[PDB]
Amino acid sequence: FAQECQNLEVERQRRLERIKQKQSQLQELILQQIAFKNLVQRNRHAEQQARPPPPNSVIHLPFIIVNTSKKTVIDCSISNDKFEYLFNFDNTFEIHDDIEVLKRMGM
Amino acid sequence: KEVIDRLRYLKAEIEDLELKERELDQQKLWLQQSIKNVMDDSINNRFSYVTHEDICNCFNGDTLLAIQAPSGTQLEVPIPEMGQKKYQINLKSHSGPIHVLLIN
């Protein structure tokens, strides 16, 4: 039939477009590991020339980075409900991940 | 007909495409596993951190908020509706407490 041809050509491209994206995240995952390995190796070398204190000057993985304007007021609320955190901003913000900051710093 | 073996050809290619995805699904699932094994060595966890200087170099200006939470922590951000508009972040952590560093 005919629409059995239109159905597989749309499904083809789909498969193709998905298999492609999968091969992209697959190398990204590889890049994530080498970046993590080098980051560890980098911190071990720095410790041999110096140990940094825990709550200060250090951020452990995983983490996120929230970026907003200097004029933006940030509020942190904890309620009666458990395992809940609520941050409020009076203006727009951006969220960045551990993976992206590792890429921005090289590895 | 031009269409009936446009079919047989297309229906001959998707299985190569099918198996390629099966392969790519197995490669991804034990690449992820190998990533999980590395980040929970106790020696590796000891040095899995970043400093202020690193954050500052990748984020020019402004106010920076660093939030650290255990794995599996869920982050929910609602739509900027109006009630003034609301920009918020809902954090749910079941495995522990969260640590927030104000970067300068």
Partner: peptide, 29 residues
């Protein structure tokens, strides 16, 4: 009615969609 992100278990594509949503806000249809 909201976008979700998971610490050490969610693609960075998730945060990109979150950042775009916040920057754009409510859109005309």
């Amino acid at each position: 009615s909201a976008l979700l992100y998971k610490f050490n278990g969610s693609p960075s594509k998730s945060l990109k969609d979150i950042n775009n949503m916040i920057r754009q806000g409510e859109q005309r249809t």
